[PDB]
């Protein structure tokens, strides 16, 4: 699976990718990696839009990260993704 993604040493699956995405919900953000269980950066609220460079898989979601102001990496999960399929849920926002 994952053919088009490489992976690091915890498991995660990382492409190189760059788009922006807007919110439809409150998303809680999350510093140090693709972790739900890392400490949290903040949210993005409906409507608001960031710019990703880096697409992972890990910890039952596709995650895009950005760089905040202070140059702190910021992982933001987009939808649930099953490891063992490669199922896909819905995004939670918009991709353009
Ligand atoms: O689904 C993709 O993104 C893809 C990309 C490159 C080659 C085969 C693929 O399915
Ligand atoms: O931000 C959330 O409430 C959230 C919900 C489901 C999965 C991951 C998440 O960060
Ligand atoms: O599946 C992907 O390749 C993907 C990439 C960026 C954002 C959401 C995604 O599902």
Not at 61 to 78: A, F, N, Q
């Amino acid at each position: 699976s994952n053919a088009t993604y490489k992976v690091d040493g915890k498991g995660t699956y990382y492409k190189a990718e760059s788009a922006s995405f807007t919110a439809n919900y409150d998303i809680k953000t999350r510093l140090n990696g693709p972790f739900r269980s890392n400490p949290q950066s903040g949210v993005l609220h409906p409507g608001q839009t960031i710019k990703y460079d880096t697409v992972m898989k890990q910890d039952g979601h596709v995650w895009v990260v950005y760089t905040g102001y202070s140059g702190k990496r910021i992982y933001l999960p987009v939808r649930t993704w099953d490891k063992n399929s490669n199922t896909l849920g819905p995004l939670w926002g918009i991709i353009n």
